[PDB]
């Protein structure tokens, strides 16, 4: 075995084709399935795995009540091969109410965060054993990507934040080698708030697109250098913006350096990636709620801040059906690196008061150079019938 280096070119994407679906909430009405939120996907050299943050309970269970809170002592990181639902035989890999994972070509790294809100701990677990730990530096909810990390030549990188959601916050990038922390860099450039990054290898470096809870409805960008640990940052130029809430496409605007100050506060985790001067991205179909999901290409949208020319639209979930977090992952092929994405399908409280629980399904899509048609792939559970 050898470390990953991602040094192949990016594949010629024409759009996205279906790859996987879990059916978790429909199976839960007659079966023992875990309650979860904040899922993600990541792959070793042979196959892909699905991850999620459990709530320490199955769904048809007295402990499923009030499962809406994000931080408790009972949350753990669940891990399965992609397409096996989270049944009672699932492995718990670490204690965590926030996490990230990646495979360096020889073994898994997991980054796991737990403890008191104002004095939290992060554990680094590599090849099945604890190797390092660090403590909250700003004493106000230490947090990380809820999605895969990226590793080149044995060095992994992860983005971590501490401090306020509606003001200035402290963000650092940690460089890690076989679980040992080797270097740390503070965030630099013009990005002013940085949460829940989605990251992809872009050899020789790494590139991340993130959430701005403070002032942007345009998304921040962070570029990371693996050879000298340097950092730079900016915003996605496209006039069609990716955050939720946002202004309608008739009236939205963006800036390559600054938060647009349009419906800026709050947000949702998402993704975008460069394709020359064009950008591919996904977003909720509705502008003020997490309903539907669509993807498209914007012409010159990576470099021209006034562009609104979209093409190759696809609906993934139609406007009547709930969505949630979404994120990128990368897969190495015979001659190029492909890009794929996943969407969280949230059900139950607080919006759907027919039940006492909150949980999710998922659906997954991968980039194709061939051709494709149309459809919609929602969650598909009937909350009027199944256990309260």
């Amino acid at each position, epitope marked *: 075995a050898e470390y990953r280096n991602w040094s192949k070119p990016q594949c010629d994407i024409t759009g996205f084709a279906p790859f996987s679906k879990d059916n978790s909430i429909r199976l839960s009405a007659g079966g023992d399935i875990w309650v979860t939120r904040e899922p993600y996907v990541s792959c070793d050299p042979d196959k892909c795995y699905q991850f999620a943050l459990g709530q320490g309970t199955t769904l048809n269970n007295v402990h499923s009540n009030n499962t809406v809170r994000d931080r408790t002592p009972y949350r753990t990181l669940l891990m399965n091969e992609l397409g096996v639902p989270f049944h009672l035989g699932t492995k718990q890999v670490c204690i965590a109410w926030s996490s990230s994972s990646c495979h360096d070509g020889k073994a898994w790294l997991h980054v796991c965060i737990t403890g008191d809100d104002k004095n939290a701990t992060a554990s680094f677990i590599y090849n099945g054993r604890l190797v390092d730990s660090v403590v909250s530096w700003s004493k106000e909810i230490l947090r990380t990507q809820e999605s895969e990390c990226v590793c080149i030549n044995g060095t992994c990188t992860v983005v971590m934040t501490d401090g306020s*959601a509606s003001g200035k916050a402290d963000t650092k990038i940690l460089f890690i080698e076989e679980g040992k922390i080797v270097h740390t860099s503070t965030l630099s450039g013009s990005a002013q708030h940085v949460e829940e990054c989605s990251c992809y290898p872009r050899y020789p470096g790494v590139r991340c697109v993130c959430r701005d809870n403070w002032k942007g409805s345009n998304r921040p960008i962070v570029d990371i250098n693996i050879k000298d640990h340097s950092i730079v940052s900016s915003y996605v130029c496209s006039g069609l913006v990716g955050d939720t809430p946002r202004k309608n496409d008739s009236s939205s605007s963006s800036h390559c350096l600054d938060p647009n100050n349009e419906e800026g506060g709050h947000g949702v985790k998402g993704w975008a990636f460069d394709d020359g001067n064009d950008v591919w991205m996904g977003r909720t179909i509705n502008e003020t709620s997490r309903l539907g999901y669509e993807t498209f290409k914007v012409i010159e949208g990576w470099s021209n801040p006034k562009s609104k020319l979209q093409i190759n639209r696809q609906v993934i979930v139609d406007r009547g059906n709930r969505s949630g977090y979404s994120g990128i992952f990368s897969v190495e092929g015979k001659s190029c690196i492909n890009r794929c994405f996943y969407v969280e399908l949230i059900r139950g409280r607080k919006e759907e008061t027919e039940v006492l629980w909150t949980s999710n399904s998922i659906v997954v899509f991968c980039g194709t150079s061939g051709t494709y048609g149309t459809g919609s792939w929602p969650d598909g559970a009937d909350l009027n019938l199944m256990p309260i």
Partner: antibody
Amino acid sequence: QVHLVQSGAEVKEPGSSVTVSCKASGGSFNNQAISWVRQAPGQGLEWMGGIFPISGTPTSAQRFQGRVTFTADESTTTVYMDLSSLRSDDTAVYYCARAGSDYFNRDLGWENYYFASWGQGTLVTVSS
Amino acid sequence: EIVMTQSPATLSLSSGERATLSCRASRSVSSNLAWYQQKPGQAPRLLIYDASTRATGFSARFAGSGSGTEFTLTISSLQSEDSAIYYCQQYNNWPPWTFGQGTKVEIKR
């Protein structure tokens, strides 16, 4: 009873800072947020910020974000609010109040952030 | 960010009659709406919350109404102590927690 009790009135020179404080009569700082709201003469109500007394996450309104800080102590059972770089315009009654809200969710934000109970109000004026 | 518009600005009516006050939000606040009464020279007091339910200090003569982007308060059989200023406030999920500019009631004796 639970009720909030505030510190006395003040005159401060421009460019100075002021400390105001708020204490629970019942000793009963549960995690429901303590919030600061001000009222300038003949003018509407204005939220400035707040803190959860146990879990300790502070928050501040955008207009005040560089100028104000909040801190808390269970032992004195008191929340302290410091307002810096004072100007004549800061002349107002400052109230502490107790919110219906007692948890912050990373993703979903706050819930029940309305003011159930209020202190006496403290008059602060800025003058030479 | 979310703007609260309250009307009328001033209202005046005789005792023993009904009075009505209104509030509007620049985006839908989905029932996350409260009303306060402030009597002259005192701290404000919570009157209604979730647009729909009244606090312990107030009786069946006070009623809340409306949803989404428009809201209403009604006082039945007006009395001497009702002479006060009233404010709406929203609390929809994220800061800041904006108040309306308020409505004054004075009694036409």
